[PDB]
Amino acid sequence: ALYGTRTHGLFKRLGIPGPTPLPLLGNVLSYRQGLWKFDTECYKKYGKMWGTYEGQLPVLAITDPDVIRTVLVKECYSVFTNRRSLGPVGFMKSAISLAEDEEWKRIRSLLSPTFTSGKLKEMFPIIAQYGDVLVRNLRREAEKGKPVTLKDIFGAYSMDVITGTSFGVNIDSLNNPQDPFVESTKKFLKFGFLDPLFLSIILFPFLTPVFEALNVSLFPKDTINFLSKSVNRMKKSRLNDKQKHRLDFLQLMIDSQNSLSDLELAAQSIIFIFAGYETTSSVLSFTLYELATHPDVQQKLQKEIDAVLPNKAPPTYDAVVQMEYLDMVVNETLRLFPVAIRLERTCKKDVEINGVFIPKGSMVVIPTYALHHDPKYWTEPEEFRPERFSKKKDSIDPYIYTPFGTGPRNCIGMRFALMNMKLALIRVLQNFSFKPCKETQIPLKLDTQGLLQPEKPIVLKVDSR
Ligand code: HEM
Ligand SMILES: CC[C@]1(C)C[C@@H](OC(=O)CSc2n[nH]c(N)n2)[C@]2(C)[C@H](C)CC[C@]3(CCC(=O)[C@H]32)[C@@H](C)[C@@H]1O
Ligand SMILES: CC[C@]1(C)C[C@@H](OC(=O)CSc2n[nH]c(N)n2)[C@]2(C)[C@H](C)CC[C@]3(CCC(=O)[C@H]32)[C@@H](C)[C@@H]1O
């Protein structure tokens, strides 16, 4: 009867193991140690499948590849079409990721042409120009002999490529410390699942219509207002530029208007900036950390770069995407550090998952981090071994290794993100070597809040070649 406990007997009734939930809270306060940690410990303790509660919301975690393939691929359109229902977001409900069902299919179908093979190849010289700025700014920090905080300069690179390619504007995050775009992303859900507003929605989902009527949002009003005005400024500039320009992300949405509302257009732009910034920055920083602590891998990778691009030859799109050892290094980094930590799907109706009848509205979790570190699938899972992804080896199971997800709801900017990071890695490894200093944290400790990120900022010594 009590509102805090109505569903907390479900998994016990179904014979599904899991940690005993607390009234009102469920198991959500166990997230405070980091979702990567909670999922791993539930996996090791309960096995192939376990259940938890976010407030009263039942959460079923699955690790079997075939069950994962059923949820993410086979029954996506019919059952598992959307992820969680976030809460009060305002107009950001129309963002491609947060849109649901047929509205999501339409928006994704409209935006997907942004990342065709031709469009990725077309925008590659824009990314290469920022790569030149990256090497030069990095040499400036290197030649003082002092260690380099990677997220400063690679965050600026990550924000520059997503801004220059999508909106056709060079905001020059790399050369303008105090970048309003970078700082606007910082306020969003700092405390993660310990965020008071987000936690109140988890405990009391019926508060969402109340907060929507009050224009309260999980997104910071300041961030939303700055990015919307920025998008609208670049938009008006594009309509007045009596000159040539790419058919880019911004133009694609402008074309949809002249035949997508002003708010919907802002929502897509805001999501692309959020999804593209911290992800690309973190993975680049994780990769260089692993290369600095594995100098044999760093040397071998530099040898492939010099063989394919002799005499510091500028990379081409084809060169970037076809360097085998570079691909394995990036894949192995994403195995160790899948920054989204897990995949989530909502049951839009009752469904039987692996002989288990799960009610409508429940959440299914694919614990990407736990599966990436599972010794059942990877020998010595904590070790950084790019040779795991050798083309000569057996094919990697696409439902165990899910750093970008799988199925119709997977990462739409996967190839774009892989091109950005590989371009940056080639250019800096053509010019520099990376090694740890006294200020480097070895081994790397993970934060407990939000995205998979280091507890302390990664700092490395950078020497010229
Ligand atoms: C290394 C960098 C990146 C990682 C690890 C990453 C990871 C992910 C993951 C795990 C998902 C969820 C897929 C699923 O639920 O099955 C996702 C979705 C998404 N990503 Fe990425 N991503 C990255 C870069 C980017 C970039 C650069 C963009 C923008 C250009 C982007 C835009 C999106 C969008 C829009 C979605 C939602 C797709 C949808 O719901 O239809 N991501 N990403
Ligand atoms: C803001 C975009 C959303 C809502 C959160 C994302 O996360 C971010 O984009 C960065 S979170 C952040 N950046 N800065 C601060 N302070 N927090 C996640 C977690 C991920 C990294 C990229 C993909 C996806 C979908 C599935 C996910 O796993 C999320 C997007 C598309 C989401 O729709
Ligand atoms: C799926 C990723 C996780 C597990 C949930 C996220 O939530 C999403 O990413 C929602 S994306 C979506 N919801 N509905 C649809 N259609 N797409 C949260 C809540 C957030 C928005 C983005 C950051 C973070 C960490 C701290 C949080 O607070 C969560 C990620 C990194 C989590 O690891």
Numbering used by the authors: 23 to 281, 290 to 495
Lines quoted from the article behind this entry:
Cytochrome P450 3A4 and 3A5 catalyze the metabolic clearance of a large portion of therapeutic drugs. Azamulin is used as a selective inhibitor for 3A4 and 3A5 to define their roles in metabolism of new chemical entities during drug development. In contrast to 3A4, 3A5 exhibits homotropic cooperativity for the sequential binding of two azamulin molecules at concentrations used for inhibition. Azamulin is a relatively selective P450 3A inhibitor that is used for reaction phenotyping.
